[PDB]
Symmetry: D2
Subunit: 168 residues, 4 copies
Amino acid sequence: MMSILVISGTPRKNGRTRIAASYIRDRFHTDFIDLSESELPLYNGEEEQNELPSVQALRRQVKKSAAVVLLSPEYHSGMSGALKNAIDFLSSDHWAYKPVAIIAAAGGGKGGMNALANMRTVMRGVYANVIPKQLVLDPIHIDMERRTVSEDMAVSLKDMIEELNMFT
Amino acid sequence: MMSILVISGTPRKNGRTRIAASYIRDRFHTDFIDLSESELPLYNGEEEQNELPSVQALRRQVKKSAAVVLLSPEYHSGMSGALKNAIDFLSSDHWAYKPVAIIAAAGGGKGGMNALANMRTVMRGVYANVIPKQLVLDPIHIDMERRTVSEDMAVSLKDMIEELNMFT
Amino acid sequence: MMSILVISGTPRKNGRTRIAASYIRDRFHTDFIDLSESELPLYNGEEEQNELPSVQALRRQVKKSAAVVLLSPEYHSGMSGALKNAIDFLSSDHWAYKPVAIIAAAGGGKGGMNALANMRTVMRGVYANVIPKQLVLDPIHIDMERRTVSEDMAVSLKDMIEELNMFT
Amino acid sequence: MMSILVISGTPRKNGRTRIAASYIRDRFHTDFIDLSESELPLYNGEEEQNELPSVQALRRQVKKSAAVVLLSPEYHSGMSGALKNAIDFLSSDHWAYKPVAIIAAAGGGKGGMNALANMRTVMRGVYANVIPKQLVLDPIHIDMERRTVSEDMAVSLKDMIEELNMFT
Ligand SMILES: Cc1cc2nc3c(=O)[nH]c(=O)nc-3n(C[C@H](O)[C@H](O)[C@H](O)COP(=O)(O)O)c2cc1C
Ligand SMILES: Cc1cc2nc3c(=O)[nH]c(=O)nc-3n(C[C@H](O)[C@H](O)[C@H](O)COP(=O)(O)O)c2cc1C
Ligand SMILES: Cc1cc2nc3c(=O)[nH]c(=O)nc-3n(C[C@H](O)[C@H](O)[C@H](O)COP(=O)(O)O)c2cc1C
Ligand SMILES: Cc1cc2nc3c(=O)[nH]c(=O)nc-3n(C[C@H](O)[C@H](O)[C@H](O)COP(=O)(O)O)c2cc1C
């Protein structure tokens, strides 16, 4: 399913979001953008950034994807600045009508729902079609030592991919 | 009023948000953070970033301020990635109970309200006290040639500063 | 297109939302729920309400519809209490995967976007598929004397119905 | 503390929100509005509603309060229609600058955060000052048999009242 693009929105190379994103990439054989090892600079509006290979690659990969799984940690009740910075390079030219499944990684408790709301609002702002199924990944869902997701989360992610494909 | 800190959240050196932010800085004699000329890197969670002068300065300036005017452009129905990246370096240690006035710069029409909602949610996430008065700056409110705000917007900004001081 | 259900969420019989909703009903030959002339009581959780004809009709009409146009005025930065009360009688049994187009009627200026966000969040909460195209109807878009919508709004509504049908 | 007004926003007489709201009323000796036993009709915009005793009482009680604890269940990712209906009778005349603490009652899991966001947005829409401290009451926090809150929730509510008083 290389027509699906998984975007790992944590900038932390050891972040939980990246464990979940890499799991999805390998389980469903997707394309991948990893914001913990990206050469993207901070967007600054200057024309020269349009010529940067990292920016050109981001735009090309997002535009070509048939569907996106968008993962972000919840940092201070919003998506990560790293993910929002990447989105600021993009527009409805890359996203319009694209099916998108959103996942937030949180710290437990009630966390993650504010990031999901922020992601849904921004995705609608680029005219994406965010599917109803959304997920919060808590620490209980991530095995740090084995670098994978829990059994129940794996079932949930399969259901999410099935719904994403239905909207594609 | 150097106890007020104005944060210009656009990364664009010629951005409208920066014209409004600089106006407030000069009119009310505030401290200033300009995310269009910052050395802040993308937050990456690594311990080494705690030693960076740009990060130390951001934390020191926010923590010491008695109140903040937080300005951001609305990019894709959210605050800028540049501003969110800066906030990701911070915590309730720098923001708790601080009075904050939020301003979004938009393109006209209905724009700006989604950025304001995102800013209010993230600010509450660091335990700031966002005051009720909020503003959207549209192109009609910004004189690009004279690099200042319109007469009606200047009145609105004075009312905002007065309310911010009341909550301080 | 009686498979489309238009829900007029204003409780005001002379409200602008109802002018727009009735326009859509007549232009596209839809089903109709009018919350300005409904016998629905306030939801109170009591079992007896499940037997009320108004509640049974609301549930039957929503469940059978292939798609919904959901209109609400923005009252205090949210959808109307009348519309939310009606939704409180419903569940994912009536809404799951249903394509929904949301419209907010506002007072001009920046109004309407908070109602749209509230509507999108609640609709996702019942598992509906809210389409990307959303509209705010301002007073300039409503002819009170002729009880219809402006020419530009009529074009926008046709585009909205076309997109809604695509997602159906 | 009769200058504090507690608003129980569930319409269900046996609802968990009402157990928490009644606990606060009795513990802190507050004024009380109970939307499970209210004579308020659905707001309909007609002038005659301004003369109804229930509407006059709601407006008088809210306006006179020095601070409000606003409780609502989360119904479909928003505040209850009953509470929103009551707010639709009100305006900034009753709420402007009033300190407000928001509490959502949820079903467990991740629930409650969408109601809190909706409540914060609507309260800002009437110019209230919603304090940073917010709470979600889950079933674990409510003793149905004893009709009171758990020990840890009682501590949290005392901290909330202390913060509300600070903003008053
Ligand atoms: C700056 C920062 C802010 C955070 N804010 C939140 C938050 O608002 N809510 C939450 O549930 N977790 C929050 N967390 C914890 C993350 O959810 C947690 O680290 C999770 O593993 C996702 O981040 P990661 O993918 O980088 O590991 C925050 C973490 C950091 C470093
Ligand atoms: C990537 C990008 C996204 C934008 N998204 C929005 C938007 O969602 N809503 C809006 O009203 N304006 C949007 N704008 C326009 C800005 O509001 C406008 O440029 C304004 O001047 C603020 O940006 P600035 O301070 O960088 O100039 C966007 C601009 C850019 C470059
Ligand atoms: C109680 C009340 C609250 C309102 N709040 C808002 C608001 O927050 N934002 C806005 O743009 N208009 C607001 N309005 C104005 C409505 O948007 C306007 O009346 C519009 O016509 C939709 O309402 P209607 O369909 O009942 O006419 C409010 C009107 C009332 C009566
Ligand atoms: C129509 C309806 C919708 C509900 N929606 C949600 C929801 O979106 N999220 C949630 O956590 N709980 C939801 N609940 C469960 C309530 O949170 C739970 O009943 C809680 O006790 C608060 O309601 P109460 O005060 O009326 O008892 C819903 C309950 C009903 C009856």
